[PDB]
């Protein structure tokens, strides 16, 4: 994935931002694959 | 006759020689990205 | 009172007010009360969620690979698969324990925690 | 019923029509040498 | 036998027509089902993106 | 157009188009239900139902069967009434108002009656 | 695939659905992995496995 930057109480991250980012990116890709599959099913119908 | 057939099958080639014995435009390619609320570094 | 939303990938499961949200993030247990600070956390692989409401019974949810996001007004729980208390079966959950597959054992543990058998 | 005979994910009305038509078709059947008095036919059709 | 063959083909084409019309209506309903599923998946995707 | 004029042709063709569309949507309505159709299709269906009801008429041969006598509708009045119906100027009226009547006056009277 | 060939990259193929399987089997292009039987009503389980 690429990176896009936008100019514009800070959030609390547990345990730290890096671990959550690592554990969430694969989840994001799984979500995108699921959305692609749903769109494919609708288009097929 | 069966023995002769089985023997002859050893020396027979199939058509493939197998044994008988037994550009998308990059712009159209959409890119997944991560939205980030930061100034362009 | 704070708005708890159990939202799954395949569908938004549950939404409503509650008085207290207990769960277990990676580091350890956590309890969320109305004006808790903004927070983003990852639930433990075999996590459970207890939503205590006003004038209603506790809502026990077995969560698979979820996340937690406390916002200025609402608490959002993300879940690959969240199963409500009435929907668990003791047999299958208890059987899934000690299985060779780690995800299956984690899901069974989450069901057991939701039931209360621990 | 003959309109819907080609079809279950239908409207409740369509499903009811299909089931009712199946029952009516089964009702109109009759064995040989078995004529019914008009009142019996009225009751069966009822 | 030309007429008999044509009549058989007419019956066959009628059966195919009925089946295709039924399948078209079923697919019409399935499109709504699939769109409903996409809508149901929308909020989780948006919030996880956030 | 060469015989009945341009306006008669235009109104008749509009009526035919609306009725054809409604006939096409009828199977979807019957099987998958009206709710499946879009709002545009729903309003077109309502319009077509009203038009086809208004195509009916209280005939003079029907008096022997029903108390009301028959009605005659001048061609111009029929053309203008169906033009307005296609435009969608009587959808707010109920469907039953369009059964077995003559011109626009009967339509209005049956509108107050219901 | 042609675009990747332009970039000097050999595509590595994964497939969902039987029809693509038949297509690539006819073309003899290898399929590293394949999941089938849910294209009608995919669930998050299948998407999770694929991802």
Q: E strand or H helix at G15, and its extent?
A: strand G14-16
Q: Which of F57, F49, F50 is nearest to F106 (CA)?
A: F57
E chain contacts of residue F27, beta-carbon cutoff 8 Å: 21, 25
Query: Which of G49, C35, C53 has the alpha carbon at shortest distance from C6?
Result: C53
Q: What is the CATH number of the domain that holds C10?
A: 2.60.15.10
Range of the domain at C29: 2-115
Nearest-CA distance C42 → chain A (Å): 7
CB contact under 8 A, E40 and C9: no
Q: Is D13 helix (H, G, I), strand (E, B) or coil?
A: helix
Cβ atoms of C98 and C112 within 8 Å: the answer is no
Q: Which helix (H) or strand (E) holds B3?
A: helix B2-8
Count: domains in chain F: 1
Asked whether the beta carbons of residue B38 and residue A7 sit closer than 8 angstroms, the reply is yes
Residues from chain C contacting residue G48 (CB–CB below 8 Å): 80
Work out the minimum CA distance from E2 to partner chain D, whole angstroms: 29
Q: Find tokens 């019974």 and name the residue.
A: C57
Q: Distance between CA D38 and CA D35 in Å, rounded?
A: 9
Determine the Cα–Cα distance for residues F101 and F97; give it in Å rounded to an integer: 8
- Chain A positions in Cβ-Cβ contact with residue G44 (cut-off 8 Å): 30, 34
Q: Torsions phi, psi of B10, nearest 5?
A: -65, -35
Q: Greatest CA separation found in chain C? A: 42
Q: G42 — contact with chain A (CB < 8 Å)?
A: yes
Residue pair E29/F32 in contact (Cβ under 8 Å)? The answer is yes
Q: Which domain holds residue F44?
A: 1-114
Look at chain C and report how many structural domains it folds into: 1
C10 vs G48: CB contact, 8 Å cut-off? no
Interface contacts (A, E; CB < 8 Å): 29
User: Is C10 close to G43, i.e. CB distance below 8 A?
Assistant: yes
Mark yes or no for CB contact B36/A7 under 8 Å: no
- Solving technique: cryo-EM
By CA distance, what is A33's nearest residue in B? B32
């Amino acid at each position: 994935m690429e990176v896009e930057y936008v100019g514009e109480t800070l959030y609390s991250f547990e345990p730290d931002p890096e671990t959550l980012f690592d554990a969430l990116l694969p989840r994001y890709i799984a979500t995108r694959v699921y959305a692609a599959l749903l769109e494919a099913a609708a288009s097929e119908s | 006759l069966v023995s002769v057939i089985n023997e002859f099958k050893k020396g027979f080639q199939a058509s493939d020689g197998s044994s008988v014995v037994v550009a998308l435009d990059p712009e159209d390619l959409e890119k997944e990205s991560v939205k980030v609320r930061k100034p362009a570094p | 009172d704070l708005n708890v939303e159990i939202v799954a990938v395949e569908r938004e499961l549950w939404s409503g007010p509650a008085t207290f949200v207990f769960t277990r993030t990676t580091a350890g247990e956590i309890g969320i009360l109305p004006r808790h600070i903004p927070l983003v956390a990852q639930l433990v692989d075999d996590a459970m969620v207890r939503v205590e409401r006003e004038g209603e019974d506790d809502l026990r949810i077995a969560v698979d690979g979820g996340f937690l996001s406390v916002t200025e007004e609402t608490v959002r729980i993300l879940v690959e698969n969240a199963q409500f208390e009435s929907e668990i079966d003791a047999d299958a959950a208890k059987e899934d324990a000690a299985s060779d597959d780690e995800r299956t054992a984690a899901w069974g543990r989450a069901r057991l925690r939701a039931l209360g058998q621990i | 019923y003959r309109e819907l005979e080609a079809f279950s994910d239908l409207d409740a009305a369509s499903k009811a029509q299909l089931d009712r038509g199946a029952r009516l078709v089964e009702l109109l059947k009759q064995p040989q040498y078995s004529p019914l008095a008009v009142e019996e036919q009225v009751v069966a059709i009822f | 036998a030309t007429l008999r063959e044509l009549r058989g083909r007419i019956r066959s084409a009628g059966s195919i027509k009925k089946i295709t019309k039924a399948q078209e209506l079923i697919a019409t309903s399935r499109i709504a089902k699939a769109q409903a599923r996409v809508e149901a998946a929308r909020p989780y995707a948006a919030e996880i993106t956030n | 157009p060469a015989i009945v004029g341009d306006e008669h042709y235009r109104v008749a063709q509009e009526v035919i188009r609306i009725l054809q569309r409604y006939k096409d949507l009828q199977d979807i309505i019957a099987i998958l239900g009206i709710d499946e159709l879009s709002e545009e299709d729903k309003q077109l269906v309502n319009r077509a139902r009203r038009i086809e009801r208004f195509l009916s008429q209280n005939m003079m041969a029907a008096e022997q069967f029903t108390g009301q006598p028959g009605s005659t509708v001048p061609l111009k009045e029929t053309i203008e009434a169906f033009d307005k119906l296609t435009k969608g100027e009587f959808d707010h009226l109920p469907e039953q108002a369009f059964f077995l009547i003559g011109g626009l006056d009967d339509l209005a009277k049956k509108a107050e009656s219901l | 695939f042609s675009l990747l060939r332009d970039e000097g990259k050999d595509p590595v193929l994964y497939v969902v659905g039987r029809k693509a399987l038949g297509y690539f089997s006819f073309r003899q292009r290898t399929v590293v992995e394949s999941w089938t039987g849910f294209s009608e009503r995919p669930t998050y389980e299948n998407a999770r496995e694929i991802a």
